[PDB]
């Protein structure tokens, strides 16, 4: 019944030949040009990153061999010639740099630069180059590429030129300004990148926080500081509100701001915002956008946060729009979860009222978090954020699991999840002679998934007599909608329900209790004989009023006409 053909049957004879791995350069160029990036526009990102790196090298170079010039990135679109041009005033390239760096796929001069640096250096974390392929993204959109380059050394200017097809040319040129100018002659299906507004869209999308001024057709673009890199000390609330509206594409204010920077266990520069209004985070690296919707760095229940996470250390996929499977990323996610939880807890103690209102707006996310995480200490960490009412506190007052333990030789935390307080207080099960009252949606699924908190089990609780019994018997046969009617102040009756789950389901089998001492019931009894219509109308009205007061009839519209008929025929004797 098993069919396997794999056996140790092979034996090498003769001798082995040795061979070095090779690489077909033309196919690699084609792969970068058509198969690497999900969108053509990304060539702009790559070229701008290169310009940034160039300027960064010059800044590094001016620390000792000091001297000169402005540090800028300039873009120019020519819609008539169909050209895109980028020029940086950076370190430039001599002929060996052009031949070696531009001419060799996967050779990165910026990688070699970074590897030679003292790790403490600024340039160590600002250089956005590793792979040695970004430049070839230009052939994604261009039939021809020309590069004019003038190195900062004292060296002629050069023109490098190619059509992307396995060969390029190098000649000497005048007069190249120090730095590098790249002219892309766009393909017919890419002329959109000779349009100014299109280019500006792309620049703001990926490179809006590049550390150097970016000019387009003589006008400056990137006026935004990357606030997540700066000392939390130096950010106004105004900086944060403007930055939040930009990064969240919003128009309100952040109600909470967490500016989290850490160097251990990994490099983290981030800002998280909780919006003011009632209901993602972008991933960056070295100030360049990776994902506008970071996918695996936060847990799914923290998707209500807005803002930015940047890490120098995150291993990037070759396309720079994905991350690589890594234990580092799961560690980062766990770290950020702990950090956000600690932040939220401390908010809840620094301002309990603001936190109450935060939890009323966003608690569904923490209920979901508790329900979905597998680790019990994480469930309890999140569960510290929950609020409830309690049998031992007035209505409206919020309390926590910690305070419930605080008011306990007692071993267990008893709870009752119900649509509202009236049904909870009249629960048969609320026969406890403290009970958490959990009125919020999905509360009971949350508490069941949580199981225990701080080692204590969360446990669910789950005038007369003439015709008291003919009055009541008449009512039993006239509303056969309730299963019992029994006799028990200001109200003539109330609706009571045995198990809260049934009421929950109904809102998506009740007991009626009557007060034989108040006037409308004595007169329901008195008009069971005298006037049967009026007694039926009054009966249905008392039932409906008890349903409303119990909170299980929130749209009384079906009753209104009947009520009017009751009223009209009750006032007919006036």
Chain centre to alpha carbon of residue 329:
16
- Bridge-based pairing of strands 484-487 and 511-514 is parallel
223 is a contact residue toward a copy of itself (CB under 8 A): no
- Asked if residue 104 belongs to a known ligand binding site, the reply is yes
Find tokens 């025929």 and name the residue.
Answer: 569
Chain centre to alpha carbon of residue 451:
27
Selected from 172, 242, 466, 529, the binder of a copy of itself by CB under 8 A is 172
- Alpha-carbon distance of 270 to 307, in angstroms, equals 8
Residue in 128, 130, 134 with CA at minimum distance from that of residue 210: 128
Sheet with 306-310: list strands edge to edge: 254-262, 268-275, 306-310, 281-285, 288-291
Selected from 368, 389, 444, 513, the binder of ligand 05M by CB under 6 A is 368
138's tokens? 């230009």
157 is a contact residue toward ligand ANP (CB under 6 A): no
Angle at 406 between CA 403 and CA 410, to 5 degrees: 125
Stretch in the footprint of Mg ion (CB under 5 A) among 134-142, 240-248, 341-349, 383-391: 134-142
Number of residues that bind ligand ANP (CB under 6 A): 25
Q: Which does 98 bind (CB under 5 to 8 A by kind): ligand 05M, Mg ion, ligand ANP, none?
A: none
531 is a contact residue toward a copy of itself (CB under 8 A): yes
List of residues 6+ apart from 121 with CB closer than 8 A: 60
* CA contacts within 13 A on the Cβ side of 399: 22
In the bound state with a copy of itself, the residue whose beta carbon lies nearer, of 15 and 64, is 15
- Alpha-carbon distance of 533 to 569, in angstroms, equals 9
Min dist. Cβ of residue 402 to Co ion (A): 12
Tell me the per-residue interface mask from 515 to 554 with Mg ion, x by CB under 5 A, - otherwise.
Answer: ----------------------------------------
367 is a contact residue toward ligand 05M (CB under 6 A): yes
User: Any idea of the CA torsion for 367, 368, 373, 376, to the nearest 10 degrees?
Assistant: 10
- Alpha-carbon distance of 19 to 373, in angstroms, equals 51
DSSP letter (8 states) at residue 321? S
DSSP letter (8 states) at residue 141? T
Min dist. Cβ of residue 201 to a copy of itself (A): 13
- Alpha-carbon distance of 494 to 563, in angstroms, equals 18
Q: Which does 300 bind (CB under 5 to 8 A by kind): Mg ion, ligand 05M, a copy of itself, none?
A: none
134 is a contact residue toward ligand ANP (CB under 6 A): yes
- Asked if residue 88 belongs to a known ligand binding site, the reply is yes
Find tokens 């309390």 and name the residue.
Answer: 399
390 is a contact residue toward a copy of itself (CB under 8 A): no
Min dist. Cβ of residue 156 to ligand ANP (A): 16
555's tokens? 């749209």
- Alpha-carbon distance of 28 to 47, in angstroms, equals 19
Tell me the per-residue interface mask from 280 to 319 with a copy of itself, x by CB under 8 A, - otherwise.
Answer: -------------x-x-------------------xxxxx
129 is a contact residue toward ligand ANP (CB under 6 A): yes
Selected from 50, 77, 149, 180, the binder of Mg ion by CB under 5 A is 50
DSSP letter (8 states) at residue 227? G
- Alpha-carbon distance of 85 to 95, in angstroms, equals 21
Q: Which does 451 bind (CB under 5 to 8 A by kind): ligand 05M, Co ion, a copy of itself, none?
A: none
Stretch in the footprint of ligand ANP (CB under 6 A) among 45-53, 190-198, 305-313, 518-526: 45-53
Site for Co ion in 105-124 (CB under 5 A): 119
Tell me the per-residue interface mask from 369 to 398 with ligand 05M, x by CB under 6 A, - otherwise.
Answer: --x---------------------------
Residue in 266, 335, 331, 344 with CA at minimum distance from that of residue 305: 344
- The dihedral of CA 403, 257, 441, 373: what is its sign? negative
Selected from 76, 77, 83, 108, the binder of ligand ANP by CB under 6 A is 108
- Under 8 Å between Cβ of 246 and 224: yes
Angle at 362 between CA 368 and CA 383, to 5 degrees: 50
In the bound state with ligand 05M, the residue whose beta carbon lies nearer, of 266 and 364, is 364
421 is a contact residue toward a copy of itself (CB under 8 A): no
Find tokens 């200490």 and name the residue.
Answer: 377
46 is a contact residue toward a copy of itself (CB under 8 A): no
Min dist. Cβ of residue 458 to ligand ANP (A): 52
141 is a contact residue toward ligand ANP (CB under 6 A): no
Pinpoint the alpha helices (H) of 225-351: 237-248, 327-350
443 is a contact residue toward ligand ANP (CB under 6 A): no
Site for a copy of itself in 180-209 (CB under 8 A): 181
Tell me the per-residue interface mask from 65 to 94 with a copy of itself, x by CB under 8 A, - otherwise.
Answer: -------x-x-x--------x-x-x-----
Min dist. Cβ of residue 136 to Mg ion (A): 9
133 is a contact residue toward ligand ANP (CB under 6 A): yes
Tell me the per-residue interface mask from 437 to 456 with ligand 05M, x by CB under 6 A, - otherwise.
Answer: -----x--x-----------
- Under 8 Å between Cβ of 559 and 544: yes
156's tokens? 């002629």
Stretch in the footprint of Mg ion (CB under 5 A) among 45-53, 142-150, 348-356, 456-464: 45-53
Stretch in the footprint of ligand ANP (CB under 6 A) among 74-82, 83-91, 253-261, 342-350: 83-91
246-251, Cβ contacts within 8 angstroms, sequence gap of 24 or more: 247/271, 247/273, 247/282, 247/306, 247/307, 247/308, 248/273, 248/275, 248/306, 248/307, 250/275, 250/306
Positions at the binding site:
46, 50, 88, 93, 101, 104, 107-110, 130-136, 180, 320
Contacts with Mg ion, residue ranges (CB under 5 A) = 50, 129, 134
Contacts with ligand ANP, residue ranges (CB under 6 A) = 46, 49-51, 53-54, 88, 90-93, 101-102, 108-111, 129-135, 180
Contacts with ligand 05M, residue ranges (CB under 6 A) = 364, 367-368, 371, 442, 445
């Amino acid at each position: 019944t098993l069919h396997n053909i794999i056996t140790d049957t092979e034996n090498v004879q003769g001798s082995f030949s040795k061979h070095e791995f090779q690489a077909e350069t033309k196919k690699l160029l084609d792969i970068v040009a058509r198969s690497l990036y999900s969108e053509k526009e990304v060539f702009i990102r790559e070229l701008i990153s290169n310009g940034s790196d160039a300027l960064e090298k010059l800044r590094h170079r001016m620390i000792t061999a000091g001297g000169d010039a402005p540090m800028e990135i300039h873009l120019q679109t020519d819609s008539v010639k169909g050209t895109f041009t980028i020029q940086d005033t950076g370190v430039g390239m001599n002929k060996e740099d052009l031949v070696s760096n531009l001419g060799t796929i996967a050779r990165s001069g910026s990688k070699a630069f970074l590897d030679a640096l003292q790790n403490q250096a600024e340039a160590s974390s600002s250089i956005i180059g590793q792979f040695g392929v970004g430049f070839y993204s230009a052939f994604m959109v261009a039939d021809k590429v020309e590069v004019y380059s003038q190195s900062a050394e004292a060296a002629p200017g050069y023109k490098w030129s190619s059509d992307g097809s396995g060969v390029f040319e190098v000649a000497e040129a005048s007069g190249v300004r120090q730095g590098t100018k790249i002219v892309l002659h766009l393909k017919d299906d890419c002329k959109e990148f000779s349009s100014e507004d299109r280019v500006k869209e792309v620049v703001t999308k990926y490179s809006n926080f590049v550390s150097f001024p970016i000019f387009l057709n003589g006008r400056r673009l990137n006026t935004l500081q990357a606030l997540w890199m700066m000392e939390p000390k130096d950010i106004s609330e105004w900086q944060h509100e403007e930055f939040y509206r930009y990064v969240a594409q919003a128009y309100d204010k952040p109600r909470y701001t967490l500016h989290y920077r850490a160097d251990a266990p990994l490099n983290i520069r981030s800002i998280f915002y909780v919006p003011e209004m009632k209901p993602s985070v972008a991933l960056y690296s070295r100030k360049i956008l990776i994902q506008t919707k970071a996918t695996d760095i936060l847990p799914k229940w923290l998707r209500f946060l807005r803002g930015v996470v940047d890490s120098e250390d995150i291993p990037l996929n070759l396309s720079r729009e994905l991350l690589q499977e890594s234990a580092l990323i799961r560690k980062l996610r766990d770290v950020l979860q702990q950090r956000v939880i600690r932040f939220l807890l401390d908010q809840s103690k620094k301002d309990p009222e603001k936190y109450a209102r935060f939890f009323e707006d966003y608690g569904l996310f923490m209920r979901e978090g508790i329900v979905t995480t597998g680790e019990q200490s994480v469930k309890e960490d999140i569960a510290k954020l929950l609020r409830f009412e309690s049998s031992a506190l007035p209505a409206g007052q919020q309390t926590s699991l910690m305070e419930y333990s605080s008011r306990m030789g007692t071993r267990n935390i008893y709870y009752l999840c119900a649509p509202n307080r009236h049904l909870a207080e009249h629960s048969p099960y609320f026969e406890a002679m403290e009970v958490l009252f959990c009125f919020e949606q999905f509360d009971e699924l949350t508490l069941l998934h949580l199981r225990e908190f701080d080692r204590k089990k969360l446990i669910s609780a789950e005038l007369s007599s003439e015709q008291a019994e003919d009055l009541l018997a008449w009512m039993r046969n006239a509303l056969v909608r309730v299963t019992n009617i029994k006799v028990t102040d200001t109200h003539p009756a109330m609706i009571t329900v045995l198990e809260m789950g049934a009421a929950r389901h109904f809102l998506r089998q009740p007991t009626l209790e009557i007060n034989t001492g108040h006037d409308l019931i004595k007169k329901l009894h008195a008009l069971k004989d005298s006037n049967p219509e009026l007694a039926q109308l009054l009966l249905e009205q008392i039932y409906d009023n008890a349903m409303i007061a119990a909170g299980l009839n929130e749209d009384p519209r079906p009753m209104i006409s009947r009520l009017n008929q009751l009223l009209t025929r009750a006032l007919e004797k006036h």
